[PDB]
Subunit: 146 residues, 5 copies
Amino acid sequence: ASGVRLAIVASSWHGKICDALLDGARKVAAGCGLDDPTVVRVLGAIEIPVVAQELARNHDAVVALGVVIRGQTPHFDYVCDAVTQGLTRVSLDSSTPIANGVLTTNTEEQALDRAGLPTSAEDKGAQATVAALATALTLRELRAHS
Amino acid sequence: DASGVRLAIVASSWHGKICDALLDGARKVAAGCGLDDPTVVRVLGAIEIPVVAQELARNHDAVVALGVVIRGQTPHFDYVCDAVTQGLTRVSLDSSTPIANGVLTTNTEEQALDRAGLPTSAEDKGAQATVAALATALTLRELRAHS
Amino acid sequence: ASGVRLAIVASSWHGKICDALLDGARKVAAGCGLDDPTVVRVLGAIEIPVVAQELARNHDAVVALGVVIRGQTPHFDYVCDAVTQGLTRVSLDSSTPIANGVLTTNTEEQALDRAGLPTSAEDKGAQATVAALATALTLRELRAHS
Amino acid sequence: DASGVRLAIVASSWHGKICDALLDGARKVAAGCGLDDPTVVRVLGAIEIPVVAQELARNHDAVVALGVVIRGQTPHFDYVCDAVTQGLTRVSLDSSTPIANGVLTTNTEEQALDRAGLPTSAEDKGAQATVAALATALTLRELRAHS
Amino acid sequence: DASGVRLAIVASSWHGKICDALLDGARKVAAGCGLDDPTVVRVLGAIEIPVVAQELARNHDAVVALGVVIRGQTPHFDYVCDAVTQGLTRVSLDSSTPIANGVLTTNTEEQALDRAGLPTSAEDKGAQATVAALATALTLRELRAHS
Ligand SMILES: O=c1[nH]c(=O)c2[nH]c(=O)n(C[C@@H](O)[C@H](O)[C@H](O)CO)c2[nH]1
Ligand SMILES: O=c1[nH]c(=O)c2[nH]c(=O)n(C[C@@H](O)[C@H](O)[C@H](O)CO)c2[nH]1
Ligand SMILES: O=c1[nH]c(=O)c2[nH]c(=O)n(C[C@@H](O)[C@H](O)[C@H](O)CO)c2[nH]1
Ligand SMILES: O=c1[nH]c(=O)c2[nH]c(=O)n(C[C@@H](O)[C@H](O)[C@H](O)CO)c2[nH]1
Ligand SMILES: O=c1[nH]c(=O)c2[nH]c(=O)n(C[C@@H](O)[C@H](O)[C@H](O)CO)c2[nH]1
Ligand SMILES: [K+]
Ligand SMILES: [K+]
Ligand SMILES: [K+]
Ligand SMILES: [K+]
Ligand SMILES: [K+]
Ligand SMILES: [K+]
Ligand SMILES: [K+]
Ligand SMILES: [K+]
Ligand SMILES: [K+]
């Protein structure tokens, strides 16, 4: 996976968790032979798909990272619905893997357990990057060459 | 700073007070970021927002949507919100322009007041949405083509 | 408001309420100077989007009126889902406001109370027309002239 | 009259008895409206309906989709009905052709029988879906260009 | 005899044993139908399927999608299923190609095992998806232009 162009875009709402998710992503890339990928920051999860649409015109793969926790209003449902619609529409418009590494949890302890911190049980940020990179290599084999 | 961006705000009128509070907080962030007079447009309900926002998109770098939708005794709450979701998301990708979602979705009237930026409110979503739109407009400019 | 082309498309399912909706829309059209709007009838709410798509080709605003009441099956949810997706896609393809005056209630007494009958609480049929006319008048001032 | 309209019907196969009962009511209405032999095509499941409906819309004025989806023990039910709702809605507007939704969504099997047009049923949705398609086509015919 | 049709299969890897069980059933239906060597591609997750299926569609008459999504402790379940539903439905209509939906969605692991087609399973949904893709392909072939 040395010749694949990778991009990462991560939101900033709930800072501590997002930094953990970006850390797993970066570590997976460097171990797979990719030094410095393109990393872009945004404020919220709803602003992700419009930045990924721009990034897909120059890269082989995009990894989107975020965290959305349930509150006391039905606001949770609609923030997650946009990300679902947006990323799916960007993937098929540009024929590029967009990996969804956006966490959707009920409590904030669950979000901490899936970010890849010292005592976490999981790192879905690392999973997402492996997902994007493997797909990119697959598309390269299936396409016109040699 | 964000002095060079073209910004538009579109806000509905259903529930006057809360809408007037959301517009107030949005205007204060715009002014503090260097933008004195943005394009402000009023509409009746939240369903009319996406079509007006599509018009603003072909002349602006950032569009901010403001409104309030409170749950009644019929499932009418669900489908008003569903319309705003699909509309604002499709507009954003057709025009390659960030559209901020600052339309409140609450169960009670108290909650809606508490997130509107009034004297004794817990937060202001209208101010939050305007920061979301300007910052994403500045990012796209850096990513896009310049000398 | 007299220079506005206005089309109204009303469903037939639950006849009594539909005619109450349609006459509320008529009164507020006539009061705003528009004596004779284009009125088209359809049977089910599902058939509204396709007819509105046609009416958008030579009108400034379209109003959609209907009634959907919940039964013993999840059928209620999918009828509303179609209406939501259709009118949203019709408004954005033709850059025309399409007012959503389709009533969605749990019991029948609720749908009567929102129809604008002699002793009802309010009239959503009139509200939807004011919504279309005002938005049409807004798009007029924003667009090219003179 | 109403005999100038060309009609197409696509019905899935999942659940034997009920699909045939839906097609029967559809067939009765068409012949009663002057249309003796409409284009009938069979598919396996409800997910395969949209893609055949897209093909039939290229030389027909109206298309009727028929089928049955009954709830099981997994959330599978929700996602079969989403694909049908999304698919047909896209097809109807792409081709500017009415696509009638006569696919049943029920919690039990006894509910799906009662709405299929059987000897002891309370109603028949297959007949209602066809009427909806023919009427809408005739309306579009009048609204569109003719000498 | 479906010896003429060009078939592609795309199967995710999340939950290894079940994804092997799904693909085994799909290969066997293809082999009995006269199709010896189909195009088999693997991916990591279910979200990754629609984009690989879109590439496969440019060169095949039908595509089969296989995978497993089991519910957890967070609302994550709904959203992974939502993306698969939207993606596949849009791909099938864009390309005018049947895309069979053999991605399992269950509440327990024991339920996903029972519909995969193991030695003691109740059913095999992998085989069911392929039969759906092949039959629809032959139908579109009959409906489309030929001398
Ligand atoms: O196929 C999957 N089944 C699951 O139960 C499950 N849970 C889960 O988190 N994923 C992730 C997978 O769909 C994607 O690789 C990822 O979400 C995209 O970045 C998956 N994938
Ligand atoms: O990433 C987010 N996580 C949340 O829990 C959450 N709650 C919340 O209100 N936002 C805002 C974000 O979705 C948008 O930027 C905002 O709606 C402005 O359009 C976010 N963003
Ligand atoms: O306007 C409707 N209100 C309802 O409560 C209801 N229930 C119901 O089954 N329909 C059918 C109608 O939307 C369509 O004509 C039908 O789906 C056939 O395409 C309708 N229409
Ligand atoms: O902003 C709104 N909040 C609500 O709770 C609510 N409920 C409600 O019925 N409307 C009307 C609005 O969506 C539209 O103007 C109307 O549907 C006409 O198309 C609104 N608007
Ligand atoms: O018509 C159907 N009704 C159901 O309840 C049901 N459940 C179910 O799994 N299918 C399969 C069908 O949607 C597709 O042919 C299958 O998913 C392969 O793409 C169907 N089809
Ligand atoms: K690319
Ligand atoms: K190749
Ligand atoms: K723009
Ligand atoms: K640049
Ligand atoms: K127009
Ligand atoms: K002007
Ligand atoms: K046609
Ligand atoms: K005409
Ligand atoms: K093909």
